[PDB]
């Protein structure tokens, strides 16, 4: 079956991807001026892992 | 001694269960994959056995006949552990060996090798029927009626001389109902022609294989064997006994398929190379230049040899009428024109072929001969060159020097694709579906181009009509062509052409013998193309023009033509039209194939008749 769409869940996640992707860019402006880079690497690879689940979800439906 | 065998067995169970490269337990996985498809065997590569524990390879190679049957039981014990639930049967597994030990030339086998694992190679000249060896005798006493059994392993045991518990001196009979048996086959292997010493006849071994190695070869195949060089006490000198090989691993060199009902033995890593190659827009240029790359010119003869290697398509009507799919070609011509060098090439590219000389041949040696077996004293039938070449090409060189009684035996095997026999109370029609490629000279050696074109040619219209393309290969003395040949031939002797043929293969302008042999073998199994309805409108409008042309040429010449056009030659142009569609793996034949098939027929049989 085509299951019913998670309306409020999807609006929430598409906010957090927009806010988090702005945050990763803002933190990359501090690096122009400790200064350890693992949390930047994790915040970026988490958005790739999350954007994949939503793309794979929408492409499926 | 059985403490010692139990340690040898335990050490090989642990080879199967522990041997790993990368993440994968390659012998546990191979056992399970073989159990599911139900072949109870394991192939072991001996570099891995040396890599695990060299003491085991030492034990194995010191006395194979006593250690191979201990590794077979170690395989069965693992086979139970990995495929049956304990505390909730399989036969004795075969061990098959692969090796890269140095090949011993077949004539260098001597007393130094008795009982050793020996790797070698040769041409299979014969295969026997299958025979049954026991692996388990059920047993009962004649007198007291005690009952037991004997497990048998077939290296280098017999019925016991004592009742085991007066009961008598030879007490036991075999209960056939409860006994179990295995297949055994005898081969004979001749040595490779390029390894025979000067002036000697090629030497021969008999050898035996059993279980999953039986039926894995056919006469004429070139093979490498791993086996135990060993001895048997034949009744056929003093203190003397006959050598043979217990075969432990046949390995056919080119994946020549053996006894094979067209089954899908190819692998996706080569099938996807062929399925790209089919779709190359230049494919017919590539295959034409890959035929005999050291032979200059002869472009149409190469184009026709490519058609002959594919053949057309075989058909079977609701009438029951069978149509020939195989293409036959005649190279009739002047001396030193590469006719025999092209026959010696088609013998190597074709997946099955036989080269023969018509002067070195007989009717019986070509077709099938009645032999008398010295033991039964019965007659039996043996296949000649046409039966050995079945499903392939027979190359008949010196076809003009064949006797008139011998050439006629070929007439059935070129059209109806059978060899009929009625001799010594044998009667059969044997199947023999081959292309014939033949080479000949005219009467008077050269073509003598001023003389009547029928007075140059010896052959009757009965045999000439059985050839789909006849090439009258004239040599013409044009100085620009002779310089173009002279430069080319010198580049062969001086070793330049070797590097050019390597560079053209790397450039993709040419393909190797091994690749081409496997491409031909694939096209014969994936395509049998039909004519499109529009291809018939062209081939009909053409063939009636070819007959009008012939009738006019006969009216000038005041006689029946010696090279004929007949309806067997319409079917030649149809069959060529299909061969060109098999090259590119087309499911159908089209107006572009019909144009090239009419062109090749014009450049061969019709320009040969026009002389």
């Amino acid at each position: 079956e085509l299951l019913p769409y998670p309306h409020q869940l999807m609006k929430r996640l598409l906010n957090r991807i927009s806010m988090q992707s702005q945050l990763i860019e803002n933190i990359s402006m501090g690096f122009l001026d400790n200064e350890s880079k693992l949390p930047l690497l994790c915040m970026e690879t988490e958005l790739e892992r999350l954007k994949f689940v939503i793309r794979s979800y929408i492409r499926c439906r | 001694n059985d403490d010692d065998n139990t340690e040898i067995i335990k050490s090989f169970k642990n080879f199967i269960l522990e041997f790993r490269l990368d993440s994968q337990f390659i012998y546990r996985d191979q056992l399970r994959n073989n159990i599911l498809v139900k072949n109870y065997s394991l192939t072991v590569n001996m570099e891995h056995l040396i890599g695990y524990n060299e003491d085991i390879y030492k034990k194995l190679s010191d006395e194979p006949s006593d250690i191979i049957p201990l590794f077979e039981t170690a395989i069965t014990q693992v086979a139970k552990r990995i495929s049956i639930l304990s505390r909730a049967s399989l036969p004795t597994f075969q061990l098959i060996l692969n090796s890269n030990a140095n090949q011993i030339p077949l004539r260098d086998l001597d007393s130094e090798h008795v009982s050793k694992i020996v790797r070698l190679s040769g041409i299979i000249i014969s295969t026997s029927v299958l025979s049954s060896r026991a692996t388990y005798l059920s047993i009962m006493c004649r007198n007291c009626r005690h009952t037991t059994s004997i497990t048998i392993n077939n290296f280098n045991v017999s019925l016991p001389r004592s009742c085991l518990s007066n009961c008598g001196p030879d007490p036991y009979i075999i209960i056939h109902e409860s006994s179990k048996f295995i297949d055994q086959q005898f081969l004979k292997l001749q040595e490779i022609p390029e390894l025979v010493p000067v002036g000697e006849m090629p030497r021969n071994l008999t050898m035996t294989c059993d279980r999953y190695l039986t039926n894995k070869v056919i006469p004429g195949t070139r093979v490498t064997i791993v086996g135990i060089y060993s001895i048997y006490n034949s009744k056929n000198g003093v203190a003397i006994r006959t050598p043979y090989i217990k075969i432990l691993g046949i390995q056919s060199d080119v994946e020549t398929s053996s006894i094979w009902n067209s089954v899908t033995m190819f692998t996706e890593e080569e099938e996807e190379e062929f399925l790209q190659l089919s779709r190359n827009p230049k494919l017919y240029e590539i295959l034409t230049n890959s035929i005999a790359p050291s032979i200059f010119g002869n472009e149409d003869i190469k184009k026709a040899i490519v058609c002959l290697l594919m053949g057309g398509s075989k058909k079977i009507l609701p009438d029951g009428m069978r149509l020939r799919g195989d293409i036959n070609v005649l190279l009739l011509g002047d001396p030193g024109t590469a006719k025999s060098q092209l026959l010696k090439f088609v013998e190597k590219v074709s997946p099955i072929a036989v080269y023969t000389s018509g002067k070195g041949s007989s009717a019986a040696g070509l077709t099938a001969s009645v032999q008398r077996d010295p033991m039964t004293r019965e007659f039996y039938l043996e296949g000649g060159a046409m039966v050995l070449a079945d499903g392939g090409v027979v190359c008949i060189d010196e076809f003009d020097k064949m006797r008139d009684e011998d050439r006629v035996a070929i007439h059935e095997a070129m059209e109806q694709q059978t060899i009929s026999i009625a001799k010594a109370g044998i009667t059969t029609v044997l199947n023999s579906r081959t292309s014939v490629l033949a080479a000949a000279n005219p009467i008077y050696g050269r073509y003598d181009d001023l003389k009547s074109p029928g007075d140059n040619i010896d052959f009757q219209t009965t045999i000439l009509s059985r050839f789909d393309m006849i090439f009258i290969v004239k040599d013409d003395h044009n100085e620009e062509r002779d310089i173009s040949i002279a430069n080319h031939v010198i580049n062969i002797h001086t070793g330049n052409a070797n590097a050019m043929q390597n560079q053209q293969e790397e450039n993709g302008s040419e393909i190797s013998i091994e690749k081409m042999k496997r491409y031909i073998t694939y096209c014969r199994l994936k395509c049998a193309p039909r004519l499109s309805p529009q291809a018939a409108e062209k081939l009909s409008s053409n063939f009636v023009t070819i007959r009008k042309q012939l009738l006019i040429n006969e009216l000038e010449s005041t006689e029946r033509s010696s090279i004929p056009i007949t309806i067997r030659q319409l079917e030649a142009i149809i069959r060529i039209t299909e061969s060109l569609a098999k090259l590119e793996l087309s499911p159908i034949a089209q107006e572009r194939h019909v144009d090239e098939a009419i062109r090749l027929f014009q450049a061969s049989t019709m320009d040969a008749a026009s002389q």
Binding site: - | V198, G360, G365, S369, Q371, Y444
Partner: protein, 97 residues
């Protein structure tokens, strides 16, 4: 091909172009051979092999000889006003070998 009197199945016996393999075969009075005998040489001149298919034996022997032949012209004497192809009873496929 020989048939044994005892085991009485077929085998190969090698001729002069096998017994001279990596060597020479010397053919005296080559013009006076029968044409049926003389034309057996055509494979062993160029391909340096002997391809038999007789009595269910189908195989190829090696035959890498040099052949030296001696002959007389037609009529027993050379006649210097004629072309070679008229001085000799041979033909282009064997003369070119």
């Amino acid at each position: 091909v020989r048939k044994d009197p005892i085991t009485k199945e077929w085998t190969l016996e090698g001729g002069a172009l096998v017994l001279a393999d990596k060597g020479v075969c010397l053919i005296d009075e080559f013009d006076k051979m029968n044409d049926q005998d003389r034309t057996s040489i055509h494979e062993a001149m160029e391909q340096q092999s002997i391809s038999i298919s007789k009595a269910g034996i189908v195989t190829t022997l090696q035959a890498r000889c040099s052949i030296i032949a001696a002959a007389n012209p037609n009529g027993g004497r050379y006649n210097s006003t004629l072309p070679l192809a008229q001085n000799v009873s041979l033909t282009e496929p064997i003369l070119s070998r």
